Amino acid sequence: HHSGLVKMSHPSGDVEACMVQVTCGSMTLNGLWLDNTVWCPRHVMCPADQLSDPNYDALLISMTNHSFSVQKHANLRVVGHAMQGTLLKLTVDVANPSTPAYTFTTVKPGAAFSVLACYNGRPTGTFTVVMRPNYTIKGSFLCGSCGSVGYTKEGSVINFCYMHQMELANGTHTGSAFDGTMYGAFMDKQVHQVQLTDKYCSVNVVAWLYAAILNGCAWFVKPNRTSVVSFNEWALANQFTEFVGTQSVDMLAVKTGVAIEQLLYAIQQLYTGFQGKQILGSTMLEDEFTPEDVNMQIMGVV
Amino acid sequence: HHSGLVKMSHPSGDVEACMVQVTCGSMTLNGLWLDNTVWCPRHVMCPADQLSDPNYDALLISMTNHSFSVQKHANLRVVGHAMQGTLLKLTVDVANPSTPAYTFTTVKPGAAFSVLACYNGRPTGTFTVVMRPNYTIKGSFLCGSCGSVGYTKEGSVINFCYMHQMELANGTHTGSAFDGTMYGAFMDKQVHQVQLTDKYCSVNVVAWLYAAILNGCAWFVKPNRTSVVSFNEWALANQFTEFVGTQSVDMLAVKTGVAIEQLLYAIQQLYTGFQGKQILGSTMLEDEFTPEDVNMQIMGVV
Ligand SMILES: *[C@@H](O)[C@H](C[C@@H]1CCNC1=O)NC(=O)[C@H](CC(C)C)NC(=O)OCC(C)(C)Sc1cccc(F)c1
Numbered sequence A, B: 001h002h003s004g005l006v007k008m009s010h011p012s013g014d015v016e017a018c019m020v021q022v023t024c025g026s027m028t029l030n031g032l033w034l035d036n037t038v039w040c041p042r043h044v045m046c047p048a049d050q051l052s053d054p055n056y057d058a059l060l061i062s063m064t065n066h067s068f069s070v071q072k073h074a075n076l077r078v079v080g081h082a083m084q085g086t087l088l089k090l091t092v093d094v095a096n097p098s099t100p101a102y103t104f105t106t107v108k109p110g111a112a113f114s115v116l117a118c119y120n121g122r123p124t125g126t127f128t129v130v131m132r133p134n135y136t137i138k139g140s141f142l143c144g145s146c147g148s149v150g151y152t153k154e155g156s157v158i159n160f161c162y163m164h165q166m167e168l169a170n171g172t173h174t175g176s177a178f179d180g181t182m183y184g185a186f187m188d189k190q191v192h193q194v195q196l197t198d199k200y201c202s203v204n205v206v207a208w209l210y211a212a213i214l215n216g217c218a219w220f221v222k223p224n225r226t227s228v229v230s231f232n233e234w235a236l237a238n239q240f241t242e243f244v245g246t247q248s249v250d251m252l253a254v255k256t257g258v259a260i261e262q263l264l265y266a267i268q269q270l271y272t273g274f275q276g277k278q279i280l281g282s283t284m285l286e287d288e289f290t291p292e293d294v295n296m297q298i299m300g301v302v
């Protein structure tokens, strides 16, 4: 029996109209064109021989307005340039006529956002990822994908929350919010960097367990319960994130009739082992589906 | 270590411009607007009391040109109507100015296509699915999602291959190609229908095993080999599809240096059990990634 839950991404049509190609010499990457501002990663100014330890402040001074080439596949003239954190704020004389209503937001661990993978300013694919506790994402990025944007949608408004910058040794990816800060303690330098541990997202495992109950799979549900405070103490010693309930989780509890503390106890015993049984066709706990995903995809509640 | 493989969907911007709302009385659903033709499922004409066993031929005669209301969120006047198989071919006086270069194709088991989920003619989300051997898909569809389209992209040309029609008891979904034929032996009637067995896609499991080798995971690779003919005989008695090699699979074999017959032997032993080990973080064989997905996402080869 299929759960009805898939990795669902937002429609990308609004964001594809904001994708441009930015070249600052020998390096090309993607940029976000909103109004008269083009955002792009700041290592576009970096020559290939200084990626390991670049001085962006000196490089920015070395740049002029005619040093950035912006193209849409239309060529955009740069009338101003500035750097905020690990991002470049290039000003252009033409405002994007297809600029959507948008905000800039920071995404937190356990939350899901949609990614538009682009190369040479041309959208290539879309996928959804969950920001992991170590502030990395398990995405699909290759050379030239920097500048690809991550976004969430609340109505007609697109909340941009991620710009791809680098890939780690473990194969995961990290980037920067549109305030210039890289997620976690990461730096936009081509060096090996210490990566924090990854943890199971408790609020997403609880949602995934609720989805099984909404699909008739409730063998793991027992009348025993574990409080949030006790579970969070247990989570700290078992590579699980501390659980914080939300209204979305409460809706799932109300509809199913199963308490959160019942599932918290279940996660503790399911962590020790599924014992040859399966939940939604899996033998491991899944934290890649948010409570809002289960609310939306299965019950049509947004 | 993350494999670098995610469920990747095509950009949906081109298809979102072709999505319309079709209402033929008390039922509303989605339609595909290409040139002066609007395609939509034919049970839009069905009153709610006859969904179990509808006479579409009589219903079509009962309809007029003014019986179909087509709206884009612009209202489209219907200047002609026809029925092909399980699909309606409505002619409108206005051609879609954003019609992309497109073809109509039939997707085969094991192949992957992108789906644009729509409700009331408004795109809501996108996801990618693999057509299963029983000619069903493990999608995320709800009431009103009929008319959502499935498509593949070869360059700038969009090959439409799926229109959502119904959901089965197992939670999977099936639809019709744009020639009017429902995939498999399914009928667009609100009754329980016999569903064929589902099988592991051998060509996709081979691709998934190759992706592990491309990520350093090759503990399952042994010098022993199993021929395609012998594997296909084994596949017939173990719920596996018969393997047919492709050029894409050959590229993966050439790059890795591991023969297909080596992995066919591995699948036979991995089917008996992973024996406590994991491949790409999984204890079961995965057939939801095509050889082209591994070729594109990991090696950038399209
Ligand atoms: C976009 O310009 C590009 C995107 C990556 C290419 C491979 N996969 C990607 O997503 N980003 C870069 O080339 C980065 C340039 C830096 C920010 C100046 N670097 C990058 O993605 O990774 C560099 C490292 C982190 C791989 S350097 C490294 C070396 C040895 C061991 C190790 F763990 C890290």
Ligand SMILES: *[C@@H](O)[C@H](C[C@@H]1CCNC1=O)NC(=O)[C@H](CC(C)C)NC(=O)OCC(C)(C)Sc1cccc(F)c1
Residues within 6 Å of the ligand: B029, B043, B051, B052, B141, B142, B143, B144, B145, B146, B165, B166, B167, B168, B169, B173, B187, B188, B189, B190, B191, B192, B193
């Ligand atoms: C679009 O109109 C809508 C989409 C589905 C609603 C629920 N999930 C969907 O994807 N499709 C329908 O309502 C179909 C109308 C038919 C084609 C006239 N029916 C449908 O999706 O399923 C009807 C069945 C197959 C559930 S009837 C049934 C009853 C008992 C047991 C059983 F296995 C099947």
